[PDB]
Amino acid sequence: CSLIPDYQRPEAPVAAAYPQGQAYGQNTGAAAVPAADIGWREFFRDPQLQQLIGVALENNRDLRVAALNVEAFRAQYRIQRADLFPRIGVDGSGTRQRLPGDLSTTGSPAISSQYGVTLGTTAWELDLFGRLRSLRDQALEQYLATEQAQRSAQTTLVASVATAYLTLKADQAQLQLTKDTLGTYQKSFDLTQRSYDVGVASALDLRQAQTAVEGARATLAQYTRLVAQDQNALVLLLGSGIPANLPQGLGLDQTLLTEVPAGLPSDLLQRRPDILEAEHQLMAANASIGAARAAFFPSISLTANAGTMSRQLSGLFDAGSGSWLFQPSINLPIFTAGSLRASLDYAKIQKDINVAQYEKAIQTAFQEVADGLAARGTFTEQLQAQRDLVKASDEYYQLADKLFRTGVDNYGTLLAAQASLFTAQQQLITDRLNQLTSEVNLYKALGGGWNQQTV
Amino acid sequence: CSLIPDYQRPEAPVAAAYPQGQAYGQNTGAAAVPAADIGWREFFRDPQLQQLIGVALENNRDLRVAALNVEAFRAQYRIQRADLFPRIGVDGSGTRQRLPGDLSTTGSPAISSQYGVTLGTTAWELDLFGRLRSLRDQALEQYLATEQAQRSAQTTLVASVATAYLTLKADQAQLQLTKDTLGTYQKSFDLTQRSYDVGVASALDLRQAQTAVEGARATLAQYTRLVAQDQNALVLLLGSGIPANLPQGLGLDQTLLTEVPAGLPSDLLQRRPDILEAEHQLMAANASIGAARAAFFPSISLTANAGTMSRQLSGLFDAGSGSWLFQPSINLPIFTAGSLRASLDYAKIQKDINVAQYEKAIQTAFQEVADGLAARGTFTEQLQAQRDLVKASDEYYQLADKLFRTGVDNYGTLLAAQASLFTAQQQLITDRLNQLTSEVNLYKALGGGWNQQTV
Amino acid sequence: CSLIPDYQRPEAPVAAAYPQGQAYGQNTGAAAVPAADIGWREFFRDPQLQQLIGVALENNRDLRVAALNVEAFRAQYRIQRADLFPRIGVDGSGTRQRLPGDLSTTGSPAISSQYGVTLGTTAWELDLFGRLRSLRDQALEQYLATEQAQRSAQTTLVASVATAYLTLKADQAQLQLTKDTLGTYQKSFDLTQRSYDVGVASALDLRQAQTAVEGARATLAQYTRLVAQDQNALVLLLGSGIPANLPQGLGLDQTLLTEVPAGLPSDLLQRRPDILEAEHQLMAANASIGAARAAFFPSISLTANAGTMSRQLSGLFDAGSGSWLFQPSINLPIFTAGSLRASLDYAKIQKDINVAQYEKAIQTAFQEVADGLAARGTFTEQLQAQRDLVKASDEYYQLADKLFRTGVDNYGTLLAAQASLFTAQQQLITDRLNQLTSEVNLYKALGGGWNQQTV
């Protein structure tokens, strides 16, 4: 039999729909092709990024450990499943003992002997009330949870590799922008030095140009270091070296991702890996509850063997030395100071803990997807405003430069316009990077890229 | 008996008083009503924040798991306490075996049988030297440590909910400030466009106003996203949806907290939950030391039953088939290659580890409270200086605007004054948020809000 | 015998040499004195920092726990090593039972008794196929891994203490710079107030000076708090109070560290502690594999004792009551539904997990050392550019001040120059701190300071 209680999946303690407001667009509703089914080969349009994600999937050591844990829990489940059948082996027993007079069968001190070679099982637990079967089902649910954990680990690895790639590309763009601005500042400083050496353009302008040049140089060194360290982080995430014949990657100013649907919050209960991991852990706790109650009921043991026995060692395997033993045992606990009841309470408490953790996983998934949706709703406006800011700063800088080539305006306003333009372009690169990272993390939260191609 | 060593609480490896310096006010000394006794209903003056903290206490899943762990460790302690009494059950045993001639009692191959149904205990460990009792005391101290951990978890949850609430309110204030500044910039840009279309006010001023407008727009989008995500984080911390009929909350510019006394560092040894958790873990290690030494002394086992026995199955429960078994056993370890000594060394080492962890908990509490006191000592001056900076920036902006409505000054100085005022107000909001968060974290470090009302 | 497989250290899945590029200098190659052998007494030139690192090594509680874990794992290994030898003890057994007629030797209900006091071993497992020896070797490798973990913990503690010291010193430098700039701003504001009260210098300049003063005041309060909290963090890392008679420390503008060689990436396989920890864990998993396969082969048990036995209690220790028991047992598993095979699969999977974790430790070490090398290659240029920026800002500020003491220029340009100089000096202090922290972390990654003096 089985004393495992019925499993009822708890209600999702989240809102029926994703949040709405000044930062959220209209709820799209139920999705035909959910986010978890959109393969990462189609979500990420950059072919070099796709090849890097493949190299990471095949070489990342953390994902390797996450995949091997599934094998380990499968082996543990197979052990627990084997625990049901009798362990049949060959038992070779010998006994030789001296007994005093009052204990020996002859009345005087005597040396008795007894030898046996038998085949059979010792203390086999007949699982009549489903204790070992409940433990086996618990192990099976823990294995399924480990499999879901491996899927979640793959989604996390894909998201992290994409984030590292985009961060390296953004820092390379920043480094190139700093190169260009430093070259412009150095050209301007050389012209101002030529002017200063012939009495024109006071030291003030020369010192101003020198400050600009040195600031650009420091930023150049900083961004060089950042690019090198981003490459290091990408190599670490890949688990292997960067291939030499990578395809041509797409720039930040291009469409890098396919817009992924949000779906309903109920899609997380069936599509997000860690939620299913928590659910399988809950079902494992349920099976453990079953195993714990199986302890109140009678336990049945069987010791059964057949073979040869003799008083002499020379009498072993002789005709007529055959023997067999059949020993059933039934035990029924009557008084366990509170012990079985406390164990059952512990099992119930563990199931409640898994319920709470499953509910919190649902809530965390909801929060992360809602943050991703807020990012999707606001980053378009923020990037458009930053585009317009960079454009207007460029127009202002061009007007100041045209009013400076004519004696109209001075050098300080021109340098201020240059600095504002540089900072605006930096912030534009940063906002692009943040938008892309937010979309990648939303893709990971909705279901990730467990599938390579769209199913 | 009991071989558990005496417990002596280690001296607090911290200073007798909290640090003093340019950032710390005068030490208040011993507090009449300590910080841990001040309820969170009285520490937090915002009624909406109080209702949110209540909803979080009743719905947060992490606190639910922390409370269920106390139940689980209570069940484990009850199991260990039950382990002391004999496990009395009904044993039904059967035996049927064929023996060869030289081993059977008849001289020829014979099939012997034996059946019994008895009531009693098997291998009951008479806890004469306090091994099981020491294990039970270890389980009890671990349960008390779990209870202290639940209290610490509640304090952490209260602090986190308050921090999320204050962060959401501060970002909403930032969003409103950005709305106002963007409206001002748009009005100014429209006036400058009207002027530019009639020959007055050169393109330079128009491009300047456009840059200001676009920057304000980007900041607006950013703060909208931040407010949405802060609401998401608050909802996650609550474990439930935000109620609709919440009371009227207080603004950041109002008195939100009651100033909490610092007390002496010795108050942490009796009022902070995680320190008591570490202390209970240490006492559990002490009881484990007792259980480990109980192994060198003689162990006593008892197998005692009474019931019916027979050679035939039909002879069971017949008159005259009564039987009883009394089997005492005493074992004394003589030679254990180093095994018992190494186990005792392991127990002593575990107690030393718990001592070190208790001392480090004390030190961490001291460091956190000292950081909170430095924040209390410096944030008043910083906020006053920021108030005066915002005031002087407003005066400068008004003077520039009055010198711009008259042809006196130009547009660039006015826009620079506006930008400085906006940044000063942003920094004022940020400093208010940081002061409030520091005070909340100091309240959590001193003892938290385990009590709802002041005891 | 021993069924443990051969151990082959996996190839390092990292590049043969450290990365090269615009941020990396030329690879130095194999180092005569590797980084791990350079003692921290010689790496850190600040004598006060050396004394603080010593106080931390002697008083930090985390390092104390890391050292006690080595003792605990040594005790566990000693237990596993003791498990090989027979446990010889004194067994005192008594038996008194009533048997019915059909089971007693007299044909009628009879009370039989039997007492014995013997010395010997019970169920001693003759480790013929190396199961207990494999478990002992696994425990030994886990102990060696714990020792390597203690070494890694010491390196981490040294790096953290150095980082805290340098951060406190940098924030103190920032606080002094803010003091000086605030004093200058207050002097200028007092002069501007004197001027304004006599009709000279319009309110605009007065409000400008007031804004500067208030900003400097707020920054002063902030840096005071930061210095106090850095001192708190240093005290926490030390595990004890700061000594009063510390030696004279060196300033940030001095040479604080000795340039440490990078060596080859192959040096990490023999010099970095956590990599050796992972390797010892892998060898422990190998020994566990050996123990798991030892289960397929015959197990041998021995129950052997000698002492006195009698039917009466008065017959104990009487002449002629001597007795001895020799009971060998041999078991050979024949049918284990998949159980032994699944356990062996689990052992192999655990060894593969340890292989993957060892490889990932190697990769992480490579990434951290490469980041340190990029920092070493770029921070010199960045600090030189920041030096030149501070110098040019000082020259520009002096020119503006000389053009302001003469009626030439106004107050706004002078204040802007002052603000730029202050920010440049702040960034210089920050860049110095970051360079020093990067070099300290590179020293920790290459091998740390496990040795006090250079070996």
Ligand SMILES: CCCCCCCCO[C@@H]1O[C@H](CO)[C@@H](O)[C@H](O)[C@H]1O
């Ligand atoms: C011979 C049958 C004796 C059964 C005695 C059961 C003693 C009470 O044990 C009960 O067993 C249940 C399992 O079905 C548990 O779920 C209950 O919580 C527990 O109280």
Ligand SMILES: CCCCCCCCO[C@@H]1O[C@H](CO)[C@@H](O)[C@H](O)[C@H]1O
């Ligand atoms: C020789 C002892 C005979 C059995 C008497 C043991 C009585 C133990 O009493 C036990 O106390 C616990 C709480 O204290 C309860 O939870 C248990 O239900 C109860 O059995």
Ligand SMILES: CCCCCCCCO[C@@H]1O[C@H](CO)[C@@H](O)[C@H](O)[C@H]1O
């Ligand atoms: C019959 C009594 C025999 C007792 C032999 C004890 C062997 C030495 O064992 C001792 O036991 C102590 C427990 O009291 C431990 O605390 C000691 O550290 C341990 O060395």
Ligand SMILES: CCCCCCCCO[C@@H]1O[C@H](CO)[C@@H](O)[C@H](O)[C@H]1O
């Ligand atoms: C058949 C074996 C008879 C017993 C002899 C076993 C001797 C084991 O010697 C053991 O070595 C350990 C360290 O090596 C010590 O810590 C133990 O105190 C010591 O008993």
Ligand SMILES: CCCCCCCCO[C@@H]1O[C@H](CO)[C@@H](O)[C@H](O)[C@H]1O
């Ligand atoms: C009496 C000897 C019987 C040995 C039967 C071994 C059954 C197969 O067991 C084998 O044992 C090996 C250990 O050497 C393992 O490494 C193998 O993977 C396992 O398949």
Ligand SMILES: CCCCCCCCO[C@@H]1O[C@H](CO)[C@@H](O)[C@H](O)[C@H]1O
């Ligand atoms: C009374 C039962 C007699 C023994 C028959 C038990 C048959 C169990 O079959 C087992 O199934 C497993 C997978 O399902 C396999 O891995 C095992 O190799 C196999 O032994």
